[PDB]
Amino acid sequence: VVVEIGKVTGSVGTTVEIPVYFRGVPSKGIANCDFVFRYDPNVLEIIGIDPGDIIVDPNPTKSFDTAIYPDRKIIVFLFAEDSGTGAYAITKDGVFAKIRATVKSSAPGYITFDEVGGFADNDLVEQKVSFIDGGVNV
Amino acid sequence: VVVEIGKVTGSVGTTVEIPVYFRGVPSKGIANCDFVFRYDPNVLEIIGIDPGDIIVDPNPTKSFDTAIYPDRKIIVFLFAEDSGTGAYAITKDGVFAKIRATVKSSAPGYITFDEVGGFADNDLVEQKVSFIDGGVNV
């Protein structure tokens, strides 16, 4: 399993979307996972983070949650398959989330992997994961 | 509204419980809130964090969630009233959560307030909050 933060470009004053990709998803699927990303609030102002299309839960906001802490310079991602039967597990490669941010400076806006929490398939077995960094104008 | 991390004592090798108190809860209740705490993984090893009795949701784990990041030295608390009607809102003073940790050293084990996210009543109005620090053997 590989998690990749996309690399995009944008002008000062405009709002961009940075996608987070999941690839190499196992057959059993991913029932839950959580991780933290680091960013610079002086370059990028996070307006919101939306669930990707791989989130099969009919009401994505139930299974997907995020917390943003500017002062700490971190973003927390928490995914917990809401059905409780493994029904809403992530089973296909694609877009996991979309970060919406306003570019405040032309300085590079890095979004880097900081730390992983859990990351397990439907049988609650922990998976091997690798993260690739990205950001805006990098 | 005041959030207080309790102060407890314990011996090296034993497991303790540090309670988190909520006081001055408004009439409308608290529908959601999130915040981060800092700790030292060399002194305290967090085994788990359980929802307090003020969490009225019949299945507390639905409305209450936490993430623990040892390397980053932080604990993230996320409360989001699960009914979606304001039914499971926190409406009375009491114990919000209980941190279970194994004491690994007799050095002071501080659990300090780091940053707040949201904190609103049932009408989605943001509340004024103050945090008091605590920990083990402090």
Listed by start position, the domains of chain A span 1-138
SS3 A90: strand
Q: Which chain A residues have any C-beta within 8 angstroms of a chain B C-beta?
A: 34, 36, 65, 67-69, 71-72, 74, 76, 78, 80, 114-115, 117
Closest CB to A117: pick one of B36, B67, B115.
Answer: B67
Nearest to B79 by CA among B29, B132, B27, B114: B29
Header resolution in angstroms? 2.2
Nearest to B23 by CA among B98, B126, B131, B115: B131
Partners of A74 on chain B (C-beta within 8 Å) are 72
Partners of B76 on chain A (C-beta within 8 Å) are 67, 76
Element (H, E) at A82: none
Size of interface A-B (CB pairs under 8 A): 33
CA dihedral over A95, A55, B70, B90, signed as positive or negative? positive
- Name the fold adopted by B1-138: Immunoglobulin-like (2.60.40)
Nearest to A85 by CA among A66, A52, A63: A63
Nearest to B33 by CA among A64, A60, A33, A67: A67
* Residue B58 burial (CB count, 10 A): 10
Q: Which chain B residues have any C-beta within 8 angstroms of a chain A C-beta?
A: 34, 36, 65, 67-69, 71-72, 74, 76, 78, 80, 114-115, 117
| b/e sequence A113-124, b meaning 16+ C-beta within 10 Å | bbbbbbbbbbee
